[PDB]
mmCIF file of N, CA and C in Angstrom:
data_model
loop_
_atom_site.group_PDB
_atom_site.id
_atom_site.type_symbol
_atom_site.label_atom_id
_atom_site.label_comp_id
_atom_site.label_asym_id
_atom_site.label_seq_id
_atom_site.Cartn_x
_atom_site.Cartn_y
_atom_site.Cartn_z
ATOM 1 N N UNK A 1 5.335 -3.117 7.294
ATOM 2 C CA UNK A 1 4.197 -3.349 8.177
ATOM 3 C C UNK A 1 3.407 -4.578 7.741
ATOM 4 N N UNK A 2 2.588 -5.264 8.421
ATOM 5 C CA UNK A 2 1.828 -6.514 8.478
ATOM 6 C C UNK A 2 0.814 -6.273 8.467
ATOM 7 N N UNK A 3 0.190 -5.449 7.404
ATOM 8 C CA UNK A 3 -1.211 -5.153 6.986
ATOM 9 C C UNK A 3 -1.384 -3.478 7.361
ATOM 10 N N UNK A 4 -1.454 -3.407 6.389
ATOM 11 C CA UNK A 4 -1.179 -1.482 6.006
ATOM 12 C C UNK A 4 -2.611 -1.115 6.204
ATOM 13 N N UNK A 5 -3.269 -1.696 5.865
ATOM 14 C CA UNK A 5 -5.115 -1.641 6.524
ATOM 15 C C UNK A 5 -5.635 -1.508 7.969
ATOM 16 N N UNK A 6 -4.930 -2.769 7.991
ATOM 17 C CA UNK A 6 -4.974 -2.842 9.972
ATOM 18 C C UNK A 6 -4.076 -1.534 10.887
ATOM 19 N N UNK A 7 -3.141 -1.730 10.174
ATOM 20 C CA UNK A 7 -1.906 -0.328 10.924
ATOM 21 C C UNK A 7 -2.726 1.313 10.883
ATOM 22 N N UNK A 8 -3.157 1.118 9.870
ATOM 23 C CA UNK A 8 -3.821 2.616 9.472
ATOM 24 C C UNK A 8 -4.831 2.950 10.892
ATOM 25 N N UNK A 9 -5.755 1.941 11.364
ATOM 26 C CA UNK A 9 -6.255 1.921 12.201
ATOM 27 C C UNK A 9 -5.555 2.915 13.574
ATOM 28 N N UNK A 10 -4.535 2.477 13.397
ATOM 29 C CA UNK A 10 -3.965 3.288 15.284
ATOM 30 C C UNK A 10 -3.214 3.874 14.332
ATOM 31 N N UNK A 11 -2.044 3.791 13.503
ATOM 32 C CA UNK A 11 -1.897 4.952 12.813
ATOM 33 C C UNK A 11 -0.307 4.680 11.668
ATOM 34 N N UNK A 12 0.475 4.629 12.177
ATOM 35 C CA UNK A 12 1.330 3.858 11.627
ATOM 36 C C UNK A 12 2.323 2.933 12.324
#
């Protein structure tokens, strides 16, 4: 993933 921070957001 391209930013595990940002992804977490909506979810994976």
């Amino acid at each position: 993933i391209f930013g595990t921070i940002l992804g977490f957001l909506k979810g994976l």
